[PDB]
Nucleic acid binder design. Structure first.
Lengths: 83, 117, 47, 63, 127, 98
RNA sequence: UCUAAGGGUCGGAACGAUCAACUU
RNA sequence: UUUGGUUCUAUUUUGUUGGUUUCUAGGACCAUCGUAAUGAUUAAUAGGGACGGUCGGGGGCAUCAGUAUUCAAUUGUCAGAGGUGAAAUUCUUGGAUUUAUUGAAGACUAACUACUGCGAAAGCAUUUGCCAAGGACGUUUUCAUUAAUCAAGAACGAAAGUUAGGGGAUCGAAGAUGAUCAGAUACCGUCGUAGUCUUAACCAUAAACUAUGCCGACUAGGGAUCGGGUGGUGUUUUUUUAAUGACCCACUCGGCACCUUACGAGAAAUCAAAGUCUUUGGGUUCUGGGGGGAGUAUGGUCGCAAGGCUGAAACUUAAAGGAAUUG
RNA sequence: GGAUAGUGGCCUACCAUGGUUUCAACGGGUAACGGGGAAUAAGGGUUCGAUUCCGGAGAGGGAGCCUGAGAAACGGCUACCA
């Protein structure tokens, strides 16, 4: 938890910085192959040993975010051409 | 199967004694060994582990939450996973007080572990 | 078995308390009250 | 252990010890099953064999 | 969910319509037994002739007054200060009465076990 | 039933290879009838996998999906990903394809 | 000034063979 | 009945004492042989599950469709377009108001739609598909007592309302102004915040209704719209034809949602129960005890908040209140 | 094991975690002495209890004692508080 950040700065803040916090570490899937062993060295970065390979990890959560849509939308246009 | 031990009724008859003989019937049949004969074959096999009337509730009820686990929004799916559940439990007891050990099974990895063969 | 309910209750502690056939006490003031609706008069009472 | 199988090594020696024993005894009375395949199967084959040595007729002829 | 008033509340539930009685619960040594004390003192007709799963033994023709309703009751005490009192259930002292008690010995009637000074449970009460 | 349903009968008869090396042996040795190679399983460990038996004598139905799951398929749960069903069963591995 | 607890290497629930200490 | 199965306890005599191992049976123990209809209530118009048929605006998730709304780019021209009781505020030689191609955005699912289908309940109407469910039916399939209602505890719970981000068409709290009034902080315009949608998380209230607890009985008639039985007849599939098939008609039953009239119930109204029982009676969960003071005071808990949940007493009044009938 | 006139955690020590509870523990309240029995009962019940008789407990509060067969005493002491 926070409290890490001890009783100092209020609440709402802690809250948030906990939201992104528990999320700042421990992923959790194979963007290559194997098991849960990636993360996010800082920001952008996020490599994984069960391959020993780095993925372009999102921010405070190496999970792309809006690239959900992109996941679709992007590769989705790949539909046309060639269906 | 044993629930379907009587898919015999379909093409053999007659529910089913034979395994005793009371309000009996009228057709060929070669007695207890006519039953047993292929009645033992039946499920291409046998069983007994424990215990059908649950080995089914726990199943439908088991896969029953795969969706729950992924979907997770079909709250109108929890509202039953509770019920197929409270059921899967309600059984136990009449075995937790009789047929199945005295804890596990009668408690089992229930909630949860896809069991078991 | 079960079940106790309302109406008249045990806890008491009012203002004469002794359910007294009176209550002795000195005559603080002479406040002649005043009648309520319908009827009407100077209802001479005492505090 | 990595939790607290202990509280003073005399006690790992303990549970290891006792435990082991008790378990060994549990097999030492699960042998009962042996008792109950023997003292029953004996009279299974003995009810068959007694059904044979009390009605051995068509056994000398048959076909 | 309670074989007693179940069926006595069908005889009861019947003769008030007026008729020739009908089916009932399933049988019960007790059902049949009241559906005896009844006949044996009068009121009902002839306990009847079914036989099924437990549905066996009887239907049972009506006949007569039998007014009104067999008594079902759902407690059970008895004897001396008792019986006489729960004889307040009755439709009036001067005869009439009949309180089909359960008597330690015998499923008996207000008097039928007033008999050999008996007592016990209070199974019911007729007319 | 489906292949994700055929391999469940498979794990009751037949010859579960369980491997990725022992997979290679299964093949080269000479026994690997099919070959169940998961999607996850890296390219080379797939293209050379291929080559191995496409050399030997066997047909290989590229797997369904998850490796971590492709095992739960064949019970284990230990994320297998390249089986070599070696012996017959009560399944249509002779009709896995057309 | 006493009592008790808590250890390492060699040999079969073993004993102690032996070795060394803080501390509660 | 039977050393083979051991294993005791101490009695009787041996003179007395004690200690012995012989018995010697008397328990319990595993075996062995022999006896005997040699051991298992029914299959609840109770409940669970099997199965196969299917139905449904049931649930999740994707994705389709549509018209419009308001808005744009370019339009055609040309003098008013609003807007109600009647006006006004405004828009307007800025190209509005009225059409002209096209696309843009989020709501929303018209019409058919009813006599209603489905859901625990709230609530559920575009397309296709994937995901797991559900009753009723059909058999006696499989079990055999597993059940019935429940203080505790919990899962879902409309709308507003909170948290954070996405957008943001429409309408639209607050807020403005325009009329209207003696007075208008409104009701009638018109802008417009929030909100309305959304995702992860809270909130747990509602005229949350059918103002009617759950389970099982029994008590009486007809009609009409969902699964199963038969005669099938009615018109067409299947076609050169029959038949079958599809709808479809008639008699049944099941269970559904509902309607129309006796005994019996009620204060009435009304009630297929709100029925049965003098005035017990089938089993249970729950709440009420004149109005107010009040769902307030205090306490504890829940919550971010708004609030929820629990919840008094003092005092104060004799009426408040249902239904009916007439003015 | 120590005490007791004598059981027993009665008290000591040493050792073990136990014993109660929604079938209501625990805690709070009593303008609470209990039971005889009292009052108004169609019945079913409400309500009452320190006048007598039983059993208890106390002589201002509170301990501790000598006396003895018998008392933690009232019409006996001892100290404290009053």
């Amino acid at each position: 938890i926070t409290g890490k950040y001890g009783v100092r700065y209020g609440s709402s803040l802690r809250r948030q910085v906990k939201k992104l916090e528990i999320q700042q570490h421990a992923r959790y899937d194979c963007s290559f192959c194997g098991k849960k062993t990636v993360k996010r060295g800082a920001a952008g970065i996020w490599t994984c040993s069960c391959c020993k390979k780095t993925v372009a990890g999102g921010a405070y959560t190496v999970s792309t975010a809006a690239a959900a849509t992109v996941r679709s939308t992007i590769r989705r246009l790949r539909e046309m051409v060639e269906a | 199967e044993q629930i379907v031990k009587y898919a015999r009724k379909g093409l053999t008859p007659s529910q089913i004694g034979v395994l005793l003989r009371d309000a009996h019937g009228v057709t060929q049949a070669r007695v207890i060994t006519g039953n047993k004969i292929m009645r033992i074959l039946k499920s291409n096999g046998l069983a007994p582990e424990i215990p059908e009337d649950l080995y089914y509730l726990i199943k439908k009820a088991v896969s029953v939450r795969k969706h729950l686990e992924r979907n997770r929004k079909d709250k109108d799916a929890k509202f039953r996973l509770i019920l197929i559940e409270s059921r899967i439990h309600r059984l136990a007891r009449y075995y937790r007080t009789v047929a199945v050990l005295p804890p596990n099974w009668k408690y089992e990895s229930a909630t949860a572990s896809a069991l078991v063969n | 078995n079960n079940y106790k309910k309302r109406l008249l209750g045990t806890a008491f502690k009012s203002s004469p308390f002794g359910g007294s056939s009176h209550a002795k006490g000195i005559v603080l003031e002479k406040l002649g009250i005043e009648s309520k609706q319908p009827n009407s008069a100077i209802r001479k009472c005492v505090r | 252990s990595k939790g607290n199988a202990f509280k003073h090594k005399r006690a790992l020696v303990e549970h290891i010890i006792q435990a082991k024993a008790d378990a060994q005894r549990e097999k030492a009375l699960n042998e009962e099953a042996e008792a109950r395949r023997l003292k029953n199967r004996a009279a299974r084959d003995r009810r068959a064999q007694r059904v044979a040595e009390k009605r051995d007729a068509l056994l000398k002829e048959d076909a | 969910s309670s074989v007693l008033a179940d069926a006595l509340n069908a005889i009861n539930n019947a003769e008030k319509t007026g008729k020739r009685q009908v089916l009932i619960r399933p049988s019960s040594k007790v059902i049949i037994k009241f559906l005896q004390v009844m006949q044996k003192h009068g009121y009902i007709g002839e306990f009847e002739y079914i036989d099924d799963h437990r549905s066996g033994k009887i239907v049972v023709q009506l006949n007569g007054r039998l007014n009104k309703c067999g008594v079902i009751s759902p407690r059970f005490n008895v004897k001396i200060g008792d019986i006489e009192k729960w004889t307040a259930n009755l439709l009036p002292a001067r005869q009439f009465g009949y309180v089909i008690l359960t008597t330690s010995a015998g499923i008996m009637d207000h008097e039928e076990a007033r008999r050999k000074h008996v007592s016990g449970k209070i199974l019911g009460f007729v007319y | 039933e489906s292949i994700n349903q055929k391999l469940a009968l498979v794990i009751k008869s037949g010859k579960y290879t369980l491997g990725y090396k022992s997979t290679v042996k299964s093949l080269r040795q000479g026994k690997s009838k099919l070959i169940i190679i998961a999607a996850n399983t890296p390219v080379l460990r797939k293209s050379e996998l291929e080559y191995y038996a496409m050399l030997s004598k066997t047909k290989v139905y590229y797997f369904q999906g998850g490796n971590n799951e492709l095992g739960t398929a064949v019970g284990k749960l230990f994320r297998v990903g390249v089986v070599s069903i070696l012996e017959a069963g009560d399944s249509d591995i002779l009709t896995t394809l057309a």
